[PDB]
Design an enzyme around this catalytic site. Sequence first.
Site, mmCIF file in Angstrom:
data_model
loop_
_atom_site.group_PDB
_atom_site.id
_atom_site.type_symbol
_atom_site.label_atom_id
_atom_site.label_comp_id
_atom_site.label_asym_id
_atom_site.label_seq_id
_atom_site.Cartn_x
_atom_site.Cartn_y
_atom_site.Cartn_z
ATOM 1 N N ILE A 1 -9.300 -0.515 7.791
ATOM 2 C CA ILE A 1 -10.504 0.294 7.649
ATOM 3 C C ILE A 1 -11.403 -0.296 6.573
ATOM 4 O O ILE A 1 -10.976 -1.150 5.787
ATOM 5 C CB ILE A 1 -10.157 1.756 7.321
ATOM 6 C CG1 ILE A 1 -9.422 1.819 5.984
ATOM 7 C CG2 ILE A 1 -9.312 2.362 8.429
ATOM 8 C CD1 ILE A 1 -9.236 3.203 5.429
ATOM 9 N N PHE B 1 1.043 10.116 3.751
ATOM 10 C CA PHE B 1 0.983 9.916 5.195
ATOM 11 C C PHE B 1 1.437 8.539 5.644
ATOM 12 O O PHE B 1 1.831 8.400 6.808
ATOM 13 C CB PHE B 1 -0.437 10.179 5.722
ATOM 14 C CG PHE B 1 -1.482 9.252 5.166
ATOM 15 C CD1 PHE B 1 -2.117 9.552 3.969
ATOM 16 C CD2 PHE B 1 -1.860 8.105 5.855
ATOM 17 C CE1 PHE B 1 -3.076 8.711 3.452
ATOM 18 C CE2 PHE B 1 -2.820 7.261 5.344
ATOM 19 C CZ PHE B 1 -3.430 7.566 4.140
ATOM 20 N N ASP B 2 1.401 7.519 4.789
ATOM 21 C CA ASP B 2 1.799 6.177 5.189
ATOM 22 C C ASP B 2 2.176 5.395 3.942
ATOM 23 O O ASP B 2 1.546 5.552 2.893
ATOM 24 C CB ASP B 2 0.671 5.466 5.945
ATOM 25 C CG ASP B 2 1.158 4.263 6.732
ATOM 26 O OD1 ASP B 2 2.371 3.965 6.694
ATOM 27 O OD2 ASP B 2 0.325 3.621 7.401
ATOM 28 N N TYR C 1 0.827 -1.193 0.000
ATOM 29 C CA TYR C 1 0.000 0.000 0.000
ATOM 30 C C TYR C 1 0.869 1.254 0.000
ATOM 31 O O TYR C 1 2.031 1.244 0.415
ATOM 32 C CB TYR C 1 -0.957 0.013 1.198
ATOM 33 C CG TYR C 1 -0.311 0.239 2.550
ATOM 34 C CD1 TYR C 1 0.206 -0.823 3.278
ATOM 35 C CD2 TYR C 1 -0.264 1.514 3.120
ATOM 36 C CE1 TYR C 1 0.784 -0.619 4.522
ATOM 37 C CE2 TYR C 1 0.314 1.727 4.352
ATOM 38 C CZ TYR C 1 0.832 0.656 5.050
ATOM 39 O OH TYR C 1 1.401 0.866 6.284
ATOM 40 N N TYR D 1 -12.280 8.009 8.951
ATOM 41 C CA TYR D 1 -11.951 9.104 9.859
ATOM 42 C C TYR D 1 -12.730 10.383 9.567
ATOM 43 O O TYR D 1 -12.234 11.472 9.873
ATOM 44 C CB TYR D 1 -10.449 9.437 9.816
ATOM 45 C CG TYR D 1 -9.537 8.345 10.331
ATOM 46 C CD1 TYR D 1 -9.355 8.148 11.694
ATOM 47 C CD2 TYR D 1 -8.846 7.521 9.450
ATOM 48 C CE1 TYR D 1 -8.517 7.149 12.165
ATOM 49 C CE2 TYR D 1 -8.008 6.521 9.910
ATOM 50 C CZ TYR D 1 -7.847 6.340 11.266
ATOM 51 O OH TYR D 1 -7.012 5.345 11.720
#
Length: 107
Positions: free
Chosen positions: A56, A36-37, A26, A82
């Site tokens: 998620i 972000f990741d 990912y 979120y």
Amino acid sequence: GVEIETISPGDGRTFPKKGQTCVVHYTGMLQNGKKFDSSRDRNKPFKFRIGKQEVIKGFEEGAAQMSLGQRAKLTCTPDVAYGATGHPGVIPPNATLIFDVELLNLE
């Protein structure tokens, strides 16, 4: 809402099932924002299983809709991960999440 944009190569038949520990390269992305990741950074490509609500909903539903070798592109809605809560410092409330998802899995 999980909208899939697959980069073509793969097999199209090896689908993840329940309890299968599957491997995903990912790469997260914020809409109109930076990363972000990423599993490419840690180079530990996130061996997770299907059906335990670990990931998620915008990423779990995209995983079962892919196959071995496939390279999809997620568009995660805010209200599945979120959108109301928002993570402190990383993911704000009402955020449309983008993921570069390639399913090169096991089991």
